[PDB]
């Protein structure tokens, strides 16, 4: 996260760290959506241009974390993957369209002050909240700059950007399964997601029921926090049918 701040304890208790077993390192962010399902970006798990193709046994999920590098005894929980599900129409060849994946945990994780699931939007919440200028929040342990790495989880709040501005900011083909967020050069303030923040959640707090909903997944960008560029997010609500289908078919 670029130009963010340290998170408060328990501020994002749905934050998941995807962790490579050997060599032991951060791979991506992710989110807890129930006691056995974690949501992330497909590209975290599969990206052939970079010879990335992870299997369940390559990985661990670490939940309840604050500190990036530290083992957070008595607080974080570490879970094994039972199964990975990548969107069957994830477009890794071109623009990361449908950049979404589910991970099923071997055993249910125990909720705590630091571990709690985020909500997934229903149609009405998404219609009401996914509007240009409305702010969401992104969190992660990714790079602090586009060139270091943070000691603890970082947070930044960012305004959704109008689709023609998103489109005119890049040469990549943008789809209805994406949205972009960030400040305009004129707006002064700044901030963005960056490498390492991938797969983490873009959340909004519903003013109707004061619950947090995950509207986006950190997906892609060109550089980090560049003037005139915006971060792109997987549009969770648009891909919801596939999400429920997977959880319904594989419980």
């Amino acid at each position: 996260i670029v130009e963010g701040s340290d998170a408060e304890i328990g501020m994002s208790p749905w934050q998941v760290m995807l962790f490579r077993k050997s060599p032991q390192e951060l791979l991506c962010g992710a989110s807890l959506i129930s006691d056995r399902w974690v949501l992330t970006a497909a590209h975290c798990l599969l990206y052939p241009p970079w010879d990335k193709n992870f299997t369940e046994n390559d990985l661990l999920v670490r939940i309840g974390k604050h500190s990036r590098t530290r083992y957070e005894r008595n607080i974080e929980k570490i879970s094994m993957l039972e199964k990975i599900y990548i969107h069957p129409r994830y477009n890794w060849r071109e623009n990361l369209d449908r950049d979404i994946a589910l991970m099923k945990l071997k055993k249910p994780v125990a909720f705590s002050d630091y571990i709690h699931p985020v909500c997934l939007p229903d149609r009405e919440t998404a219609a009401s909240l996914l509007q240009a200028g409305y702010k969401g929040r992104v969190t992660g342990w990714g790079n602090l700059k586009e060139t270091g790495q943070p000691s603890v989880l970082q947070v930044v709040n960012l305004p959704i950007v109008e689709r023609p501005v998103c489109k005119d900011s890049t040469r990549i083909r943008i789809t209805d399964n994406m949205f972009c967020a960030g400040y305009k050069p004129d707006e002064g303030k700044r901030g963005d997601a960056c490498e390492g923040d991938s797969g983490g959640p873009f959340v909004m707090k519903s003013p109707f029921n004061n619950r947090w909903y995950q509207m986006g997944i950190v997906s892609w960008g060109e550089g980090c926090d560049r003037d005139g560029k915006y971060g792109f997010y997987t549009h969770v609500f648009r891909l919801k049918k596939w999400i429920q289908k997977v959880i319904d078919q594989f419980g």
Partner: peptide, 28 residues
């Protein structure tokens, strides 16, 4: 689920975090 999106250390205790209000204020 039933209690998704309500954080134990904030909503469940009626405590606000330091910048959630910035989000509220943009929901115009």
């Amino acid at each position: 689920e039933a209690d998704c999106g309500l954080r134990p250390l904030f909503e469940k205790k009626s405590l606000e975090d330091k910048t959630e209000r910035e989000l509220l204020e943009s929901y115009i």
